[PDB]
Design an enzyme around this catalytic site. Structure first.
Site, PDB file in Angstrom:
ATOM      1  N   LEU A 100       0.734  -1.280   0.166  1.00 42.22           N
ATOM      2  CA  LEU A 100      -0.018  -0.006   0.044  1.00 42.22           C
ATOM      3  C   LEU A 100       0.848   1.282   0.153  1.00 42.22           C
ATOM      4  O   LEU A 100       1.880   1.395   0.872  1.00 42.22           O
ATOM      5  CB  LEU A 100      -0.930  -0.042   1.331  1.00 42.22           C
ATOM      6  CG  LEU A 100      -1.869  -1.154   1.547  1.00 42.22           C
ATOM      7  CD1 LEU A 100      -2.523  -0.604   2.679  1.00 42.22           C
ATOM      8  CD2 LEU A 100      -2.575  -1.800   0.722  1.00 42.22           C
ATOM      9  N   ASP A 124       5.806   9.709   9.944  1.00 44.82           N
ATOM     10  CA  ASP A 124       6.172  10.923   9.337  1.00 44.82           C
ATOM     11  C   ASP A 124       6.728  10.404   7.869  1.00 44.82           C
ATOM     12  O   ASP A 124       7.631  11.090   7.440  1.00 44.82           O
ATOM     13  CB  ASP A 124       7.205  11.538  10.053  1.00 44.82           C
ATOM     14  CG  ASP A 124       7.139  13.226   9.705  1.00 44.82           C
ATOM     15  OD1 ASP A 124       6.161  14.177  10.371  1.00 44.82           O
ATOM     16  OD2 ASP A 124       7.749  13.686   8.800  1.00 44.82           O
ATOM     17  N   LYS A 125       5.999   9.475   7.186  1.00 47.25           N
ATOM     18  CA  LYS A 125       6.382   9.110   6.229  1.00 47.25           C
ATOM     19  C   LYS A 125       6.259  10.021   4.878  1.00 47.25           C
ATOM     20  O   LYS A 125       6.959   9.810   4.002  1.00 47.25           O
ATOM     21  CB  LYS A 125       5.372   7.936   5.561  1.00 47.25           C
ATOM     22  CG  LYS A 125       4.247   8.370   4.917  1.00 47.25           C
ATOM     23  CD  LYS A 125       2.905   7.919   5.727  1.00 47.25           C
ATOM     24  CE  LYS A 125       1.638   8.545   4.806  1.00 47.25           C
ATOM     25  NZ  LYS A 125       0.463   7.648   5.231  1.00 47.25           N
ATOM     26  N   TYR A 128       9.699  11.436   3.199  1.00 47.45           N
ATOM     27  CA  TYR A 128      10.164  10.340   2.088  1.00 47.45           C
ATOM     28  C   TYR A 128       9.464  10.120   1.025  1.00 47.45           C
ATOM     29  O   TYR A 128       8.634   9.333   0.998  1.00 47.45           O
ATOM     30  CB  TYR A 128      10.637   9.069   3.078  1.00 47.45           C
ATOM     31  CG  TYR A 128      11.448   9.065   4.361  1.00 47.45           C
ATOM     32  CD1 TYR A 128      12.550   9.609   4.182  1.00 47.45           C
ATOM     33  CD2 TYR A 128      10.694   9.141   5.272  1.00 47.45           C
ATOM     34  CE1 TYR A 128      13.172   9.798   5.375  1.00 47.45           C
ATOM     35  CE2 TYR A 128      11.561   9.162   6.641  1.00 47.45           C
ATOM     36  CZ  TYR A 128      12.658   9.620   6.591  1.00 47.45           C
ATOM     37  OH  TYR A 128      13.304   9.665   7.598  1.00 47.45           O
ATOM     38  N   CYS A 132       7.832   4.113  -0.229  1.00 50.52           N
ATOM     39  CA  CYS A 132       7.203   2.629  -0.496  1.00 50.52           C
ATOM     40  C   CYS A 132       6.880   2.362  -1.852  1.00 50.52           C
ATOM     41  O   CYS A 132       6.914   1.250  -2.106  1.00 50.52           O
ATOM     42  CB  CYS A 132       5.941   2.502   0.376  1.00 50.52           C
ATOM     43  SG  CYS A 132       6.172   2.778   2.363  1.00 50.52           S
TER      44      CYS A 132
END
Length: 187
Positions: A100, A124-125, A128, A132
């Protein structure tokens, strides 16, 4: 909340991909650790509990966990932590993996009982870009996002936590309505 109906477990497997502890400071680990517990608690009472996996589980994350829970984690069912990567655990089912990611051009419209859904165990993705997407893309696996754009402001979407994404999925299995599911989790 109030759940309607009989508890029937689901075949679906959901993986918290914990290989990102490079990325976080202690506070962020401490916070990730609480969201992990929270996934398990929402699973504990779902109408359709999944098998929850924690892959690449180790290091500071495992340490913080045992520290806080003092061993209760070893009593969790249906909960499978492992040092192995999801790529290993599911060697024989690679084409059943779905990563996901809010950055996918694909969108889930339903979850299939035979598939394996991965949530990046990252806080705190937003710091970046495509983090993913890059990872799954490089592995040859499919990526998809949740079909929730009509319900969330794009700047809030990026701020959704690991348990929030899990809770939405779990709640989707109960209502089979992405909006009932989303609203249950967010407002």
């Amino acid at each position: 909340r109030i759940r309607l109906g009989k508890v029937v477990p689901s075949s679906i497997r959901i993986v918290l991909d914990c290989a990102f502890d490079d990325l976080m400071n202690d506070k962020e680990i401490n916070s990730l650790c609480q969201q992990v517990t929270r996934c398990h608690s929402a699973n504990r009472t779902a109408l359709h509990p999944v098998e929850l996996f924690a892959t690449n589980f180790g290091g500071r994350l495992k340490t913080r966990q045992d520290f806080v829970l003092k061993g209760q984690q070893n009593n969790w069912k249906r909960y499978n932590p492992t040092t192995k990567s999801y790529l290993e655990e599911f060697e024989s089912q690679k084409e059943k993996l779905v990563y996901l990611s809010a950055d996918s051009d694909n969108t889930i419209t339903e979850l299939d009982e035979d598939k394996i859904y991965i949530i990046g165990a990252i806080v705190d993705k937003n710091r970046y870009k495509n983090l993913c997407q890059n990872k799954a893309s490089e592995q040859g696996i499919k990526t998809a996002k949740l079909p929730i754009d009509e319900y969330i402001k794009i700047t809030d979407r990026k701020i959704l936590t690991v348990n929030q994404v899990f809770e939405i999925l779990s709640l989707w299995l109960e209502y089979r309505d992405w909006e009932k599911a989303f609203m249950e989790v967010i407002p």
